[PDB]
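Replying to the earlier thread about multi-chain prediction with a worked example.

Input:
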Amino acid sequence: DQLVSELNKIVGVEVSVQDGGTYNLTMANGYTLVQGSTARQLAAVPSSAD
Amino acid sequence: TKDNEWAVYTHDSSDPAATAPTTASTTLKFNENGILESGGTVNITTGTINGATAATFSLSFLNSMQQNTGANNIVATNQNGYKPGDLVSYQINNDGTVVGN
Amino acid sequence: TKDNEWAVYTHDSSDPAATAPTTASTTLKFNENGILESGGTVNITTGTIN
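Result:
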């Protein structure tokens, strides 16, 4: 609980009780940032238009 | 492509032949009332991996509801398939049955 | 625009099916100490998207 709340204080990460009782994290449209026992990963970039 | 109706597109992440398709995999039918009208169930197919067979699965969308505007809501993953793996769990239930995790 | 008479117009700011000043859905008439004597109940329609 504490670490998910900590992460939340940078970017919007939502949490949902998954049917099996697991703790799923999701981001801002449905990007399941943590689905089950797996996390997605992210990137930094220079903008496509500038 | 209409206020109050939806098409759906699917992709297999792991079969290296799975060209992320351009094609409408399914359309979920909605009355203007914002209550799922038809297509609340459909089966779709996976790719084939490592010589083992492709999987083919059923998916359901019951009690979905479509709004005046705003909260485009989905987060869920409910499926009846299992990876093979390890167990160590002995728990003798009051009925006299045993469960394993 | 006369004593003891008032008419009413309504507009849907959330669903634009409300039109220009078409049928005025109600008008009320009154007396020297105030009592509502007509048009006490009104009906309107909202545009709809749902």
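Chain A touches chain B through eleven residues (CB under 8 Å).

Feel free to reuse this layout for your own posts.
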